[PDB]
Amino acid sequence: ATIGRISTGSKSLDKLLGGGIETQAITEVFGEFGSGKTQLAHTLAVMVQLPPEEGGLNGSAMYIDTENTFRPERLREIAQNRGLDPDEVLDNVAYARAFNSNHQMLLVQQAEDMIKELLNTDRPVKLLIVDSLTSHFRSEYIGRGALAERQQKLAKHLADLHRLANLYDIAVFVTNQVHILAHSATLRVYLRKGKGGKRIARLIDAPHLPEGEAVFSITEKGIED
Numbered sequence: 001a002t003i004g005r006i007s008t009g010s011k012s013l014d015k016l017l018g019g020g021i022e023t024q025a026i027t028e029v030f031g032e033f034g035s036g037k038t039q040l041a042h043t044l045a046v047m048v049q050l051p052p053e054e055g056g057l058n059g060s061a062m063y064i065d066t067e068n069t070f071r072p073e074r075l076r077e078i079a080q081n082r083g084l085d086p087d088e089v090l091d092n093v094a095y096a097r098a099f100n101s102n103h104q105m106l107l108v109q110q111a112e113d114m115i116k117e118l119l120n121t122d123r124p125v126k127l128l129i130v131d132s133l134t135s136h137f138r139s140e141y142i143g144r145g146a147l148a149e150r151q152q153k154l155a156k157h158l159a160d161l162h163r164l165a166n167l168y169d170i171a172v173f174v175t176n177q178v179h180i181l182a183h184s185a186t187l188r189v190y191l192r193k194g195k196g197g198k199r200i201a202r203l204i205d206a207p208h209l210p211e212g213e214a215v216f217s218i219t220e221k222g223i224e225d
């Protein structure tokens, strides 16, 4: 099935990504607080709702929040400044707070129910966000021998997410805080602050995509060049 692409709002970042964030894939962005990872998540939650000639998939979004990073008024602002109705856009983002890593897993199962429900409607789910995906796992699995268990649990969680992406043709977008641990996202993107208030993006361990870095801004429209 054809891979769909969601624009990030930034022409530069979209180019680095080969056109945007892909369905049937997990894209992981990681970086320090304020690197743009959460701003990008919010922007994508709006962009996915647009028609394809505007960089979206005529879809809705789901947002799993682990560290209280979700800001409804930020979504409304991004929407308003892109010519969209802020309340309608907010209503197309299904929010859930994950209380711990086990609840986080249950939420992914519940997400499947909604995805199935909307799959053949005029606005299917096309984006599932997990912000700070590892935070609960790092808090809960800690100490001697915790590495193996934590990595196994994360691998299973990521396998569940890969299944949703592939089975239902959705983009999964996950964020993490910032070197020898394994990772199983399809594509990993490192974000960092640059000069002039810009953020800089670099693909990590992606020999299949061309060499370069993207530059973008955080504005009233979310993310743009």
Ligand SMILES: O=C(O)c1ccc2cc[nH]c2c1
Residues within 6 Å of the ligand: 062, 063, 064, 094, 095, 096, 107, 108, 110, 111, 114
């Ligand atoms: O409202 C819901 O049914 C629901 C279930 C799971 C998730 C995961 C992110 N948002 C959700 C909403």
Ligand SMILES: [Ca+2]
Residues within 6 Å of the ligand: 033, 034, 035, 036, 037, 038, 039, 040
């Ligand atoms: Ca951010």
Ligand code: NA
Residues within 6 Å of the ligand: 024, 025, 026, 162, 165, 166, 186
């Ligand atoms: Na895939």
Ligand code: NA
Residues within 6 Å of the ligand: 088, 091, 092
């Ligand atoms: Na709606």
